[PDB]
């Protein structure tokens, strides 16, 4: 097995408040 | 770029590398893999380049 | 008249790689609760990471 654990909560909110979608509809995009 | 008219560079230091084998008699177009790369691609991280 | 035919030792195949797979060849204890064994490269081996 191998070792793996989580990281601060402070850490985790402020990565998670920043992230866009990736793919989006827009009516433009050739 | 998928027209042959825009090439880029991607300035990245080290990464994750994956990769398919294919078939040589076998024509395809390989822009799906590299879309649903870019897909997946978001200021947190990215995923191992295909 | 007897036929006798080692296994080969090196892998037979398409592609060889090489891959790194902690103690993949042990044989004595059960030896330390730790182990790095990355899938091969046609895998995704972002979990080790």
Same mark, same amino acid.
């Given at each position: %097995?191998?070792?793996?654990?989580?990281?601060? %909560?402070?850490?985790?909110? @402020?990565?998670?408040?920043?992230?866009?979608?990736? @793919? @989006?509809? %827009?009516?433009?995009?050739? | 770029?998928?027209?042959?008219?825009?090439?880029?560079?991607?300035?990245?230091?080290? !990464?994750?590398?994956?990769?398919? !084998? !294919?078939?040589?008699?076998?024509?395809?177009?390989?822009?799906?893999?590299?879309?649903?790369?870019?897909?997946?691609?978001?200021?947190?991280?990215?995923?191992?380049?295909? | 008249?007897?036929? &006798?035919?080692?296994?080969?030792?090196?892998?037979?195949?398409? #592609?060889?790689?090489? #891959?790194?797979?902690?103690?993949?060849? /042990?044989?004595?204890?059960?030896?330390?609760?730790?182990? #790095?064994?990355?899938?091969?490269?046609?895998? /995704?081996?972002?979990?080790? &990471?």
């Amino acid at each position: %097995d191998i070792i793996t654990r989580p990281t601060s %909560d402070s850490i985790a909110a @402020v990565a998670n408040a920043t992230k866009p979608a990736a @793919v @989006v509809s %827009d009516p433009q995009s050739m | 770029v998928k027209a042959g008219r825009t090439r880029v560079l991607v300035e990245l230091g080290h !990464y994750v590398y994956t990769l398919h !084998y !294919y078939d040589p008699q076998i024509s395809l177009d390989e822009a799906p893999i590299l879309e649903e790369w870019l897909s997946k691609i978001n200021p947190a991280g990215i995923p191992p380049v295909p | 008249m007897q036929m &006798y035919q080692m296994t080969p030792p090196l892998p037979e195949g398409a #592609v060889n790689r090489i #891959v790194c797979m902690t103690n993949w060849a /042990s044989l004595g204890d059960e030896g330390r609760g730790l182990e #790095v064994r990355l899938p091969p490269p046609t895998d /995704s081996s972002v979990h080790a &990471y």
